XYZ file of C-alpha atoms in Angstrom:
698
model
C 76.812 -28.245 0.699
C 75.944 -25.092 -1.281
C 73.205 -23.610 -3.464
C 74.170 -20.066 -4.494
C 77.799 -19.252 -5.235
C 79.126 -15.945 -6.538
C 82.287 -15.129 -8.485
C 83.299 -11.554 -9.261
C 84.799 -10.907 -12.687
C 87.809 -8.787 -13.659
C 85.421 -5.867 -13.807
C 84.207 -5.829 -10.205
C 80.664 -7.048 -10.860
C 79.570 -10.126 -8.925
C 77.581 -12.944 -10.538
C 75.552 -15.304 -8.338
C 74.907 -18.594 -10.137
C 71.679 -20.118 -8.806
C 71.736 -23.929 -8.888
C 70.047 -26.111 -6.277
C 72.592 -28.947 -5.981
C 70.369 -31.929 -6.721
C 66.790 -30.997 -7.573
C 65.693 -30.613 -11.183
C 64.395 -27.050 -10.782
C 65.452 -24.056 -8.699
C 63.018 -23.818 -5.776
C 63.166 -21.518 -2.746
C 63.916 -23.982 0.035
C 64.140 -23.030 3.699
C 67.863 -23.853 3.586
C 68.529 -21.036 1.106
C 67.743 -18.298 3.651
C 71.004 -18.623 5.596
C 73.041 -19.056 2.400
C 71.849 -15.861 0.709
C 72.420 -13.954 3.963
C 75.989 -15.278 4.130
C 76.777 -14.179 0.566
C 74.853 -10.874 0.600
C 77.049 -9.900 3.551
C 80.137 -10.717 1.477
C 78.963 -8.222 -1.152
C 78.740 -5.436 1.436
C 81.984 -6.517 3.125
C 84.294 -5.759 0.200
C 82.740 -2.424 -0.895
C 84.782 -2.754 -4.108
C 82.038 -3.665 -6.590
C 79.902 -1.870 -9.173
C 76.961 -4.231 -9.741
C 75.656 -7.736 -9.133
C 73.656 -10.115 -11.331
C 71.458 -13.160 -10.733
C 71.534 -16.123 -13.124
C 70.042 -19.622 -13.077
C 72.517 -22.259 -14.250
C 69.774 -24.827 -14.825
C 68.840 -24.554 -18.530
C 65.269 -25.590 -17.746
C 64.217 -22.499 -15.836
C 65.090 -19.573 -13.547
C 63.278 -20.128 -10.218
C 59.992 -22.038 -9.878
C 59.016 -20.244 -6.653
C 58.868 -21.564 -3.115
C 58.105 -25.232 -2.576
C 54.557 -26.067 -1.526
C 55.853 -28.580 1.031
C 57.379 -25.909 3.287
C 53.904 -24.448 3.838
C 52.615 -27.927 4.700
C 55.140 -28.201 7.553
C 53.317 -25.512 9.569
C 50.561 -26.301 12.066
C 49.459 -22.746 12.919
C 48.937 -19.374 11.268
C 51.848 -17.924 13.258
C 54.331 -20.380 11.729
C 53.047 -19.806 8.187
C 53.147 -16.048 8.783
C 56.644 -16.421 10.271
C 58.385 -17.681 7.129
C 56.226 -15.226 5.175
C 57.599 -12.215 7.067
C 61.075 -13.763 6.917
C 60.629 -13.870 3.144
C 59.847 -10.163 2.834
C 62.614 -9.220 5.275
C 65.304 -11.078 3.322
C 64.337 -9.525 -0.007
C 64.225 -6.098 1.629
C 67.956 -6.574 2.242
C 68.331 -7.321 -1.476
C 66.487 -4.129 -2.442
C 68.490 -2.152 0.151
C 71.786 -3.005 -1.558
C 73.726 0.199 -2.370
C 75.040 -1.723 -5.370
C 72.845 -2.032 -8.450
C 71.311 -5.521 -8.584
C 69.886 -7.127 -11.740
C 68.076 -10.442 -12.254
C 68.871 -12.271 -15.509
C 65.938 -14.626 -16.098
C 66.132 -17.541 -18.525
C 63.245 -19.966 -18.121
C 60.242 -20.008 -15.836
C 60.230 -17.497 -12.946
C 56.984 -17.892 -11.001
C 55.764 -17.291 -7.472
C 58.465 -16.352 -4.995
C 60.988 -16.326 -7.829
C 59.276 -13.433 -9.605
C 59.293 -11.605 -6.267
C 63.088 -11.878 -6.148
C 63.126 -10.261 -9.592
C 60.930 -7.475 -8.199
C 63.420 -6.870 -5.374
C 66.208 -6.419 -7.925
C 66.453 -2.920 -9.378
C 66.445 -4.212 -12.958
C 65.502 -7.366 -14.829
C 66.604 -8.991 -18.089
C 64.869 -12.032 -19.563
C 65.198 -14.231 -22.633
C 62.809 -14.482 -25.583
C 62.501 -18.254 -25.126
C 58.993 -19.789 -25.104
C 59.864 -21.530 -21.810
C 60.480 -18.294 -19.860
C 57.305 -17.077 -18.138
C 56.734 -14.591 -15.307
C 53.770 -14.953 -12.975
C 52.458 -15.056 -9.416
C 50.360 -18.240 -9.184
C 50.117 -18.434 -5.393
C 46.407 -17.570 -5.639
C 45.931 -20.888 -7.455
C 47.109 -22.721 -4.318
C 44.618 -20.812 -2.160
C 47.432 -18.550 -0.894
C 48.944 -15.199 -1.880
C 52.403 -13.890 -2.877
C 53.381 -13.458 0.772
C 56.940 -12.216 0.247
C 56.653 -8.667 -1.181
C 54.725 -9.518 -4.350
C 51.535 -7.773 -3.192
C 53.294 -4.419 -2.901
C 56.479 -4.450 -5.003
C 54.631 -5.478 -8.180
C 51.760 -2.917 -8.058
C 54.204 0.023 -7.880
C 56.059 -1.292 -10.974
C 53.253 -2.103 -13.439
C 50.292 -0.215 -11.956
C 47.593 -1.603 -9.679
C 45.134 -2.211 -12.533
C 47.280 -4.753 -14.406
C 49.109 -5.936 -11.281
C 45.863 -7.099 -9.654
C 45.143 -9.352 -12.642
C 48.454 -11.168 -12.210
C 47.849 -11.667 -8.487
C 44.157 -12.633 -8.559
C 44.489 -15.134 -11.435
C 48.151 -16.156 -11.379
C 48.383 -15.790 -15.156
C 51.897 -15.792 -16.586
C 53.250 -13.467 -19.264
C 55.703 -14.047 -22.068
C 58.812 -12.002 -22.679
C 57.464 -9.869 -25.533
C 54.331 -9.177 -23.480
C 56.275 -8.854 -20.216
C 58.341 -5.998 -21.681
C 55.268 -3.942 -22.605
C 54.075 -3.888 -18.988
C 57.523 -2.794 -17.795
C 58.008 -5.922 -15.665
C 61.225 -6.756 -17.549
C 63.539 -3.948 -18.646
C 64.797 -5.790 -21.737
C 64.255 -9.120 -23.508
C 67.397 -10.446 -25.210
C 68.440 -13.822 -26.656
C 69.900 -16.435 -24.335
C 73.426 -15.972 -25.673
C 73.439 -12.203 -24.990
C 71.621 -12.560 -21.628
C 74.457 -12.526 -19.084
C 76.688 -10.327 -21.263
C 73.828 -7.830 -21.587
C 72.627 -8.355 -18.007
C 75.955 -7.247 -16.515
C 76.131 -4.390 -19.045
C 72.840 -3.064 -17.680
C 74.082 -3.945 -14.193
C 77.098 -1.635 -14.510
C 74.791 1.323 -15.233
C 74.008 3.396 -12.139
C 46.864 6.991 -17.491
C 46.221 9.700 -14.866
C 42.402 9.760 -14.908
C 42.428 6.390 -13.102
C 45.504 7.409 -11.076
C 43.473 9.523 -8.642
C 44.798 8.335 -5.285
C 41.433 8.524 -3.468
C 38.762 7.900 -6.132
C 40.475 6.799 -9.343
C 41.970 3.770 -7.616
C 38.908 3.457 -5.381
C 36.797 2.807 -8.479
C 39.162 0.050 -9.659
C 38.820 -1.862 -6.386
C 35.045 -1.477 -6.236
C 34.926 -2.694 -9.843
C 37.529 -5.464 -9.584
C 35.966 -6.692 -6.338
C 32.528 -7.029 -7.909
C 33.922 -8.971 -10.879
C 36.049 -11.273 -8.716
C 33.099 -11.944 -6.411
C 30.884 -12.911 -9.350
C 33.463 -15.207 -10.985
C 34.393 -17.043 -7.761
C 31.022 -16.655 -5.958
C 32.929 -15.849 -2.752
C 34.052 -19.474 -2.366
C 37.778 -18.610 -2.534
C 39.178 -16.959 0.616
C 42.382 -15.572 -0.908
C 40.359 -13.519 -3.403
C 39.033 -11.391 -0.540
C 42.476 -10.989 1.041
C 44.404 -10.063 -2.130
C 42.330 -6.913 -2.618
C 42.410 -6.153 1.104
C 46.184 -6.597 1.355
C 46.992 -4.677 -1.834
C 44.435 -1.910 -1.162
C 45.706 -1.004 2.308
C 49.277 -1.366 1.057
C 48.814 1.274 -1.638
C 46.509 3.506 0.413
C 47.975 3.428 3.935
C 51.636 2.878 3.167
C 54.004 0.121 2.105
C 55.194 -0.995 5.542
C 51.717 -1.334 7.063
C 50.617 -3.332 4.009
C 53.628 -5.653 4.194
C 52.503 -6.661 7.690
C 49.008 -7.325 6.327
C 50.460 -9.473 3.522
C 52.207 -11.602 6.155
C 49.067 -12.082 8.251
C 47.154 -12.967 5.083
C 49.751 -15.585 4.115
C 49.476 -17.053 7.615
C 45.756 -17.673 8.006
C 45.294 -18.437 4.295
C 47.664 -21.396 4.708
C 45.377 -23.001 7.312
C 42.184 -22.320 5.354
C 40.280 -25.503 4.417
C 40.097 -24.236 0.828
C 43.847 -23.811 0.336
C 44.716 -27.278 1.650
C 42.182 -28.728 -0.792
C 43.747 -26.724 -3.633
C 47.285 -27.795 -2.716
C 46.214 -31.453 -2.687
C 44.929 -31.438 -6.269
C 48.167 -29.666 -7.162
C 50.023 -32.602 -5.594
C 47.625 -35.014 -7.296
C 48.112 -33.259 -10.648
C 51.896 -33.720 -10.580
C 51.294 -37.305 -9.421
C 49.187 -38.033 -12.514
C 51.656 -36.148 -14.728
C 54.370 -38.492 -13.385
C 52.343 -41.749 -13.542
C 52.670 -43.664 -16.852
C 49.770 -46.096 -16.291
C 52.000 -49.094 -17.099
C 55.586 -50.214 -16.512
C 56.188 -51.251 -20.134
C 58.396 -49.141 -22.433
C 56.333 -46.950 -24.771
C 56.134 -47.624 -28.488
C 57.367 -45.019 -30.991
C 54.948 -42.212 -31.874
C 56.587 -40.547 -34.866
C 53.378 -40.219 -36.904
C 49.665 -40.609 -36.124
C 46.361 -40.526 -37.980
C 42.794 -39.393 -37.321
C 39.665 -41.248 -38.459
C 36.802 -38.812 -38.940
C 36.422 -35.146 -39.785
C 34.634 -32.006 -38.656
C 35.335 -29.961 -35.556
C 35.650 -33.248 -33.646
C 38.511 -34.615 -35.736
C 40.022 -31.166 -36.187
C 40.389 -30.756 -32.437
C 42.241 -34.050 -32.024
C 44.551 -33.220 -34.931
C 45.101 -29.671 -33.649
C 46.383 -30.679 -30.216
C 48.265 -33.637 -31.711
C 50.445 -31.627 -34.132
C 50.639 -28.165 -32.546
C 50.832 -29.044 -28.848
C 52.486 -32.479 -29.126
C 54.553 -31.908 -32.280
C 53.473 -35.119 -34.027
C 52.563 -35.122 -37.745
C 48.953 -36.202 -38.213
C 46.817 -37.100 -41.231
C 43.013 -37.068 -41.192
C 41.120 -39.766 -43.109
C 37.489 -39.102 -44.013
C 35.426 -40.306 -46.967
C 33.531 -37.002 -47.088
C 35.774 -34.508 -48.937
C 33.843 -31.666 -47.291
C 34.322 -33.339 -43.905
C 38.095 -33.034 -44.321
C 38.055 -29.297 -45.053
C 36.175 -28.551 -41.824
C 38.718 -30.648 -39.914
C 41.564 -28.835 -41.702
C 39.995 -25.360 -41.510
C 39.409 -25.672 -37.754
C 43.122 -26.308 -37.240
C 43.956 -23.307 -39.444
C 41.791 -20.867 -37.475
C 43.443 -22.089 -34.273
C 46.894 -21.259 -35.658
C 45.526 -18.046 -37.192
C 45.652 -16.807 -33.615
C 48.653 -14.903 -34.977
C 46.150 -12.077 -35.530
C 46.227 -11.673 -31.762
C 49.676 -10.535 -30.620
C 50.993 -14.097 -30.105
C 51.352 -17.406 -31.984
C 54.763 -16.490 -33.466
C 54.299 -15.912 -37.223
C 53.959 -17.644 -40.605
C 57.365 -19.165 -39.834
C 55.915 -21.223 -36.971
C 52.262 -21.136 -38.090
C 53.065 -23.000 -41.312
C 55.737 -25.032 -39.497
C 53.173 -26.619 -37.170
C 50.569 -26.675 -39.954
C 52.904 -28.625 -42.263
C 52.389 -31.553 -39.849
C 48.639 -31.516 -40.644
C 47.257 -33.162 -43.780
C 44.080 -34.827 -44.991
C 43.041 -37.383 -47.582
C 40.119 -39.643 -48.454
C 42.116 -42.524 -49.913
C 44.341 -44.195 -47.270
C 47.529 -43.504 -49.253
C 49.909 -42.493 -46.451
C 48.775 -44.693 -43.568
C 51.073 -47.694 -44.108
C 53.432 -46.569 -41.297
C 51.192 -44.788 -38.759
C 52.291 -45.764 -35.257
C 48.886 -44.935 -33.738
C 45.515 -43.944 -35.203
C 42.785 -42.172 -33.219
C 39.236 -43.089 -34.261
C 36.573 -40.377 -34.035
C 33.800 -41.563 -36.348
C 30.111 -42.147 -35.633
C 29.142 -43.812 -32.349
C 28.202 -47.192 -33.800
C 29.643 -50.546 -32.758
C 29.430 -52.258 -36.154
C 31.041 -49.198 -37.759
C 33.855 -49.116 -35.195
C 34.550 -52.822 -35.701
C 34.880 -52.103 -39.424
C 37.286 -49.260 -38.636
C 39.460 -51.684 -36.654
C 39.353 -54.045 -39.637
C 40.473 -51.208 -41.932
C 43.431 -49.877 -39.946
C 44.899 -53.369 -39.563
C 44.680 -53.935 -43.334
C 45.836 -50.467 -44.469
C 48.477 -49.728 -41.794
C 51.409 -51.482 -40.146
C 51.181 -54.519 -37.878
C 52.223 -52.494 -34.810
C 49.710 -49.640 -35.053
C 47.455 -48.874 -32.089
C 43.707 -48.301 -32.487
C 42.522 -45.569 -30.098
C 38.733 -45.143 -30.145
C 37.071 -41.918 -28.978
C 33.872 -43.647 -27.909
C 31.321 -42.456 -25.357
C 28.990 -45.411 -24.698
C 30.422 -48.513 -26.421
C 32.489 -51.169 -24.613
C 36.054 -51.497 -25.857
C 35.841 -55.293 -25.676
C 33.101 -55.251 -28.307
C 35.113 -52.882 -30.515
C 38.078 -55.264 -30.197
C 35.973 -58.419 -30.582
C 36.930 -59.079 -34.215
C 40.460 -57.651 -34.315
C 43.367 -59.691 -35.653
C 45.665 -58.002 -33.104
C 43.380 -57.123 -30.152
C 46.442 -56.180 -28.065
C 46.800 -52.823 -29.861
C 43.292 -51.389 -29.401
C 42.442 -48.952 -26.608
C 39.931 -46.278 -25.645
C 41.043 -42.640 -25.749
C 38.113 -40.471 -24.657
C 38.205 -36.720 -25.316
C 35.636 -34.041 -24.503
C 34.429 -31.326 -26.866
C 35.626 -28.687 -27.319
C 38.865 -30.660 -27.620
C 41.200 -27.656 -27.377
C 39.563 -26.324 -24.206
C 38.876 -29.474 -22.173
C 42.038 -30.802 -20.455
C 41.001 -34.311 -19.327
C 41.004 -37.575 -21.266
C 39.843 -41.069 -20.312
C 42.138 -43.898 -21.427
C 40.130 -47.129 -21.346
C 41.988 -50.428 -21.854
C 39.878 -53.488 -22.572
C 40.525 -57.027 -21.315
C 43.300 -57.682 -23.842
C 44.906 -54.247 -24.258
C 48.659 -54.699 -23.969
C 50.542 -53.106 -21.103
C 52.750 -51.551 -23.799
C 49.938 -49.807 -25.704
C 48.515 -48.634 -22.369
C 51.799 -46.871 -21.612
C 52.052 -45.741 -25.243
C 48.649 -44.027 -25.413
C 49.098 -42.061 -22.175
C 52.515 -40.837 -23.337
C 50.695 -39.351 -26.327
C 47.858 -38.068 -24.133
C 50.324 -36.266 -21.865
C 52.158 -34.929 -24.933
C 48.881 -33.339 -26.081
C 48.715 -31.320 -22.853
C 45.975 -33.502 -21.344
C 45.945 -35.005 -17.865
C 44.800 -38.611 -18.427
C 43.135 -41.117 -16.150
C 43.038 -44.845 -16.884
C 39.573 -46.277 -16.219
C 38.073 -49.738 -16.583
C 35.973 -50.853 -19.556
C 32.590 -50.473 -17.874
C 29.593 -48.618 -19.262
C 29.823 -44.843 -18.993
C 33.470 -45.133 -17.819
C 33.870 -42.615 -14.942
C 33.303 -38.922 -15.697
C 30.150 -39.466 -17.764
C 28.834 -42.051 -15.299
C 29.099 -39.721 -12.282
C 27.488 -36.904 -14.306
C 24.352 -38.570 -15.702
C 22.562 -38.815 -12.308
C 23.803 -35.279 -11.619
C 21.999 -33.942 -14.697
C 18.937 -36.195 -14.392
C 18.260 -34.851 -10.895
C 18.356 -31.242 -12.104
C 15.876 -32.124 -14.855
C 13.670 -33.958 -12.355
C 13.450 -30.751 -10.319
C 12.224 -28.909 -13.418
C 9.334 -31.373 -13.646
C 8.713 -30.627 -9.938
C 8.014 -26.913 -10.443
C 11.533 -25.497 -10.238
C 12.814 -22.634 -12.379
C 15.996 -23.095 -14.407
C 17.319 -19.681 -13.361
C 17.255 -20.884 -9.747
C 18.836 -24.303 -10.306
C 21.808 -23.293 -12.466
C 22.622 -20.373 -10.165
C 22.411 -22.692 -7.144
C 25.137 -25.064 -8.355
C 27.563 -22.466 -9.710
C 27.399 -20.901 -6.246
C 28.071 -24.386 -4.860
C 31.316 -24.417 -6.840
C 30.582 -25.691 -10.338
C 31.502 -23.598 -13.407
C 28.031 -23.687 -14.989
C 24.667 -25.113 -14.007
C 23.684 -28.666 -14.946
C 21.265 -27.816 -17.754
C 23.287 -24.894 -19.108
C 26.045 -27.509 -19.304
C 23.531 -29.777 -21.045
C 22.722 -27.003 -23.525
C 26.339 -26.066 -24.286
C 27.416 -29.691 -24.764
C 24.190 -30.485 -26.631
C 20.968 -32.150 -25.524
C 21.559 -34.755 -28.246
C 24.935 -35.817 -26.854
C 24.142 -35.360 -23.154
C 21.153 -37.723 -23.311
C 22.419 -40.512 -25.586
C 24.128 -42.211 -22.610
C 21.133 -42.385 -20.230
C 19.805 -45.575 -21.970
C 23.234 -47.219 -21.912
C 23.644 -46.562 -18.179
C 20.079 -47.724 -17.484
C 20.533 -51.264 -18.829
C 24.051 -51.517 -17.322
C 23.231 -50.363 -13.774
C 19.432 -50.390 -13.441
C 16.853 -47.693 -12.805
C 19.352 -45.675 -10.728
C 20.245 -43.677 -13.871
C 16.590 -43.115 -14.796
C 15.269 -39.753 -15.982
C 11.756 -38.246 -15.816
C 9.187 -40.141 -17.841
C 9.135 -38.233 -21.135
C 11.021 -34.962 -20.607
C 13.937 -35.545 -22.990
C 11.582 -37.387 -25.348
C 9.498 -34.195 -25.585
C 12.334 -31.663 -25.914
C 14.263 -32.948 -28.930
C 11.093 -34.171 -30.649
C 10.406 -30.432 -30.770
C 13.866 -30.316 -32.427
C 15.457 -28.487 -29.490
C 19.007 -29.879 -29.573
C 20.452 -27.084 -27.420
C 22.900 -24.402 -28.537
C 24.204 -26.500 -31.448
C 20.973 -25.698 -33.301
C 18.527 -22.813 -32.859
C 17.511 -23.034 -29.209
C 17.329 -25.335 -26.206
C 16.878 -24.894 -22.464
C 18.155 -21.350 -23.076
C 17.091 -19.026 -25.903
C 20.227 -18.039 -27.903
C 17.967 -15.901 -30.111
C 18.575 -12.862 -27.907
C 20.010 -10.473 -30.483
C 20.532 -6.996 -29.051
C 22.125 -8.549 -25.977
C 20.696 -6.228 -23.325
C 20.591 -9.211 -20.937
C 23.014 -12.086 -21.434
C 21.292 -15.054 -19.798
C 18.832 -16.416 -22.335
C 16.567 -18.575 -20.075
C 14.033 -19.763 -22.670
C 10.495 -19.674 -21.190
C 9.013 -22.110 -23.746
C 10.732 -25.036 -21.957
C 8.493 -24.786 -18.874
C 5.182 -25.505 -20.717
C 6.867 -28.165 -22.882
C 7.419 -30.484 -19.896
C 5.020 -31.153 -17.048
C 5.651 -29.051 -13.948
C 3.037 -29.346 -11.206
C 5.093 -27.985 -8.292
C 5.622 -24.336 -7.348
C 9.149 -24.107 -5.934
C 9.101 -25.537 -2.418
C 12.804 -26.379 -2.664
C 15.448 -23.953 -1.399
C 18.803 -22.829 -2.829
C 21.440 -25.151 -1.221
C 18.931 -28.013 -1.058
C 18.922 -28.008 -4.868
C 22.701 -28.062 -5.309
C 23.030 -30.683 -2.567
C 20.374 -32.969 -4.067
C 22.299 -33.652 -7.279
C 25.834 -33.427 -5.878
C 24.873 -36.210 -3.465
C 23.597 -38.328 -6.354
C 26.944 -37.651 -8.027
C 28.973 -38.406 -4.887
C 27.084 -41.699 -4.553
C 28.018 -42.732 -8.085
C 31.583 -41.476 -7.556
C 32.452 -43.794 -4.662
C 30.716 -46.605 -6.574
C 33.356 -46.688 -9.322
C 36.263 -46.635 -6.868
C 34.674 -49.660 -5.173
C 34.101 -51.352 -8.558
C 37.731 -50.511 -9.464
C 36.597 -48.436 -12.438
C 39.123 -45.762 -11.439
C 42.523 -47.126 -10.448
C 42.800 -44.956 -7.326
C 40.983 -42.374 -5.236
C 43.439 -39.808 -6.624
C 42.430 -40.609 -10.211
C 38.835 -39.977 -9.149
C 39.519 -36.576 -7.598
C 41.329 -35.002 -10.547
C 39.077 -37.062 -12.819
C 36.108 -35.054 -11.541
C 37.934 -31.774 -10.841
C 39.262 -31.408 -14.386
C 36.501 -33.578 -15.861
C 33.214 -31.884 -14.982
C 34.582 -28.893 -13.095
C 34.048 -30.175 -9.572
C 34.642 -27.236 -7.181
C 38.436 -27.105 -6.816
C 38.256 -25.410 -3.402
C 36.697 -28.658 -2.120
C 39.606 -30.743 -3.445
C 37.518 -33.237 -5.409
C 34.543 -35.485 -4.667
C 36.556 -37.817 -2.429
C 38.276 -35.104 -0.407
C 34.844 -33.484 -0.060
C 33.543 -36.618 1.680
C 36.474 -36.701 4.115
C 35.906 -33.103 5.215
C 32.129 -33.573 5.287
C 32.428 -36.854 7.192
C 31.825 -40.363 5.872
C 29.266 -40.989 8.614
C 27.467 -37.689 8.013
C 27.126 -38.097 4.239
C 25.592 -41.562 4.698
C 23.044 -39.950 7.024
C 22.199 -37.257 4.456
C 21.509 -39.704 1.624
C 19.514 -41.984 3.919
C 17.604 -38.817 4.815
C 17.296 -37.873 1.133
C 16.154 -41.401 0.252
C 13.172 -41.233 2.615
C 12.029 -37.935 1.096
C 12.793 -38.245 -2.631
C 12.975 -41.992 -3.360
C 15.392 -44.895 -3.242
C 17.788 -43.552 -5.903
C 19.525 -41.602 -3.104
C 20.217 -44.559 -0.796
C 23.903 -44.640 0.213
C 26.390 -46.586 -1.867
C 26.946 -50.201 -0.856
C 30.485 -49.296 0.267
C 29.657 -45.879 1.732
C 27.537 -47.478 4.471
C 30.568 -49.559 5.459
C 32.699 -46.404 5.615
C 29.967 -44.676 7.615
C 30.239 -47.277 10.372
C 34.044 -47.396 10.610
C 36.450 -44.496 10.976
C 37.321 -44.745 7.284
C 38.777 -41.826 5.334
C 39.530 -41.878 1.618
C 42.872 -40.110 2.168
C 45.800 -40.189 4.571
C 46.072 -37.760 7.503
C 42.370 -37.969 8.300
C 42.381 -35.848 11.478
């Protein structure tokens, strides 16, 4: 029956220990409002104090901001705005304290927690890697909504404050001190002792109030519009709330911040963003199997190059597991080792610790061509050539050169795991672990158990996958798995429009405006036309002509040796040296492939044509039990192929669009463009009945 309690010391300086009684992390619950009022009145009552400090007893963190469930318990903009204005009002009483108030921050301090630090006159933080300051409410479709949109700009400057609010990026203590956000960064032992010590103590060219700051907002607004394409409502309201707050006065802006927090909470975009946040922590909590994980003290990598280097990089640096790389090409090992060096040579940029920690993490990386240290490797990730007979040999080599409890994790793209495990002595310890290049950048992995994969090695592989910073999904051993299977018809349809007279500048721009990061064929170029088209024959024989492509388009492109960006040129130029215009848009591609049409199609009709083909294939795998749940399919496509996050995923996009309406669109598309668009066998059933993919349908 308490959360905050304060105890004054011999020197009359109060210390409020923050510790939510039961929960693992300090969150700003609705129950804390009356408590902090009751104690902040006790500070004023005595009038015999010099300073006050704020500390978080939980060693994990400081304050993780307000809980996203409290916003969900509001059915109107007035209620969401109500607790928003109540949030600013309470922290105004903290800033109005005649006593000097300091926040001592050890651990993460994000969202509403960082705002409390802004209300305090001074701040002290630790130099720990787990302490981070940020305002990530924009990532939930919302906005700081408790004083963060005005208190922060007047402390760091609008130019670098707006970055923190529009992206939600968090800063580290050494970088936080430069901006002036924290007044001092001291070790965790000195924190409180120094915090109370400080608590006892009592450019201009762009600073032009009317035009210097006016240029920033015209320039930041144009950038933010281009990056988001206007599909994120909070992005409009952050500039609006912070602009009027600085221009027309703090109090009038505070009231605009509250109204923004209110109607942003009921936006359809924000509720979609908060759901994938809830689904992300659900996946991060789900172990895929109820069996106890096997030990993972040391791992190994089969295969070299940038492919193997990426797996080894995230395995040793991010997960802290020593890894050896086995490759029979001596040159292939150096590229796998050099790639991991250049990653940790990010110490050039002000970050990455130093040679102390650079060589500490690097000492866990090693390479050899001769199988001499593999006798005790608890798990070995295979990343060699995509060939079944070669992968079967790899299985036969790890079982003979390593322990009897090792796990074979194959990074395959189009081969069934049952065929890779067909000739294994212990087929219980072989699994699919599917990464996406570039390995460091992409955050999703597909963990594919075959018919005989043990429930222990299932739980063991995901524990490693989550240790590498990846959000894994467990998908069935069917051809194409999930993320590649729902992307092949998506790319084939964009290519089929090119053969129908469309221009690539129009198509790619049409889908990034729809919500995707990059267009389908720019994606095909970046990932490689070689790799992006090697799975269309596998999915053809496994599921029929539904995954078909135009007759001889891809056959004509790479027979001209146009592999994409990996070599000289592809769908885009990449030979544009001088760089006056960024977008390459190669014009030799149009004559290379037949194109009779002359652009009848519109701008949303293009993006809808292939997203419907993708939605069709998406609900197919949840009906075939390829993905274990509809939640695994949402984050599987949101983090997998950059499905528009403001829509919540492909399955939450159907619920908002209407199961009966989407079946009518594809039946309408099928009449016009062919029978590849016909609704999924299960979607027609959901179009008849009031079926939603998610709870709380209305």
